[PDB]
Structure 1
Amino acid sequence: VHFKDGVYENIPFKVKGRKTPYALSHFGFFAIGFAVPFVACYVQLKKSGAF
């Protein structure tokens, strides 16, 4: 089966027809991407000293 082609059927994100705004998913992706070293720093700063 050849999957049908369009302007928004090339990416894994669904953008147009949703229930939530797209900014939620699009900025939460880079929120968890930008906050994985912060949670590494937190789990490393509770293991040795304080914080």
Structure 2
Amino acid sequence: DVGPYSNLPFKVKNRRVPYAVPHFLFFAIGMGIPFFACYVQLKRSGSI
């Protein structure tokens, strides 16, 4: 089964949910966590 889509941990083709959703959610979480941290520490210290 050695081939061009065999060394990757995630499945890319012949998949039920298309690959755009797992590709987008990875970057969405990666650029959304450090705004959540700032929101929590702002709300714990009085300011809006």
TM-score, normalized by length of structure 1?
0.80
Give, in angstroms, the shift of residue 50 of structure 1.
Answer: 3.5
**Aligned partner of 1:34: which letter?**
M
RMSD: 1.2
2:31 matches 1:34: yes
Aligned residues: 48
**Aligned-pair identity (%):** 62
Unaligned runs of 5+ in 2: none
Aligned to 2:45: 48
What CA distance in whole angstroms lies between the structure 2 residues aligned with 1:7 and 1:49? 54
After TM superposition, list the pairs within 5 Å mapping 1:11-22 onto structure 2: 11-22=8-19
Unaligned runs of 5+ in 1: none
**After the TM superposition, which segments of 4 or more aligned residues of structure 1 sit over 2 Å from their partners?**
none
